[PDB]
């Protein structure tokens, strides 16, 4: 199928409690495979998936240097952004970066991504062209100009089109038994009366990978979007995911409602009813 790799960086200042913490995590699709934490007793890049462990010392030290140097630079960046916004030295602030590459089903680069935020709001992003920037405000414009002057976009592009795709493909091959395996949802419908004249129908999807899934209730073939209660897809802790969707229906109209399930791992899309 299609696949992506993303690194997620978080740099958090904490005045009076030491220097800013830097954490980085790496993912292939919905599988985390590495972490680095500057607050660890001995900060180093650590494996978080079995298929990455075969990488040699050279790889681990290469990652660690990258993350150590970034830790320092993000400290500088936090100082700079506090100034760009004329902020006091008293508050805590966060820079986030998420970046990586997407491959289509044939292993080719679909597109690159490189987005940053400050205090949870879009700050600066690399455009799909991998050449130009979008800056959210006049503060971000200062970064844009700095990044233009230093030819930063060319650096990002070369990574996203080169090393990013090459290493993603390596990981996909090495972890093919899991990374390229879609596990379909196990499903069922439960029924719980809420009163004499209403009942809850809950459609369940358990044990699926990847997280992407579509779960909907229909009444008489019409989507019940506004009346459906839909929880966020949640990790089970064994790599798989869970989700449910609930509708409250007139007692006796149960058979007029159908749960539809779309997931990559299903040989066929699913249509379920409550089965008394």
């Amino acid at each position: 199928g299609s696949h992506s790799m993303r690194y997620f960086y978080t740099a958090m200042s904490r005045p009076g409690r030491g220097e800013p913490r830097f954490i980085a995590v790496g993912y292939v699709d919905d599988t985390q495979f590495v972490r680095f934490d500057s607050d660890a007793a001995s900060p180093r890049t650590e494996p978080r998936a079995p298929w990455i462990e075969q990488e040699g010392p050279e790889y681990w030290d290469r990652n660690t240097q990258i993350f150590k140097t970034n830790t320092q630079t993000y400290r500088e960046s936090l100082r700079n952004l506090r100034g760009y916004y004329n902020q006091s030295e008293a508050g805590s602030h966060i820079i986030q970066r998420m970046y990586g590459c997407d491959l289509g089903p044939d292993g080719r680069l679909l597109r690159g991504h490189d987005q940053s935020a400050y205090d949870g709001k879009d700050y600066i992003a690399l455009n799909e062209d991998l050449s130009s920037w979008t800056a959210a405000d006049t503060a971000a414009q200062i970064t844009q100009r700095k990044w233009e002057a230093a030819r930063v976009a060319e650096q990002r592009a070369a990574y996203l089109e080169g090393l990013c795709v090459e290493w993603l493909r390596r990981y996909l091959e090495n972890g093919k038994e899991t990374l390229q395996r879609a596990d379909p949802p196990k499903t069922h419908v439960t029924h719980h009366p809420v009163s004499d004249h209403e009942a809850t129908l809950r459609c369940w999807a358990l044990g699926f990978y990847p997280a992407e899934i579509t779960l909907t209730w229909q009444r008489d073939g019409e989507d019940q979007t506004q009346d459906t209660e839909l929880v966020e897809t949640r990790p089970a802790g064994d790599r798989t995911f869970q989700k449910w969707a609930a509708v409250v229906v007139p007692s006796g109209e149960e058979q007029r409602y159908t749960c539809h399930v779309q997931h990559e791992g299903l040989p066929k899309p699913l249509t379920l009813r409550w089965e008394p």
Partner: peptide
Amino acid sequence: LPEPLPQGQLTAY
């Protein structure tokens, strides 16, 4: 593999 360090100075924001 994350983005490698550049040949020069890593550019801060």
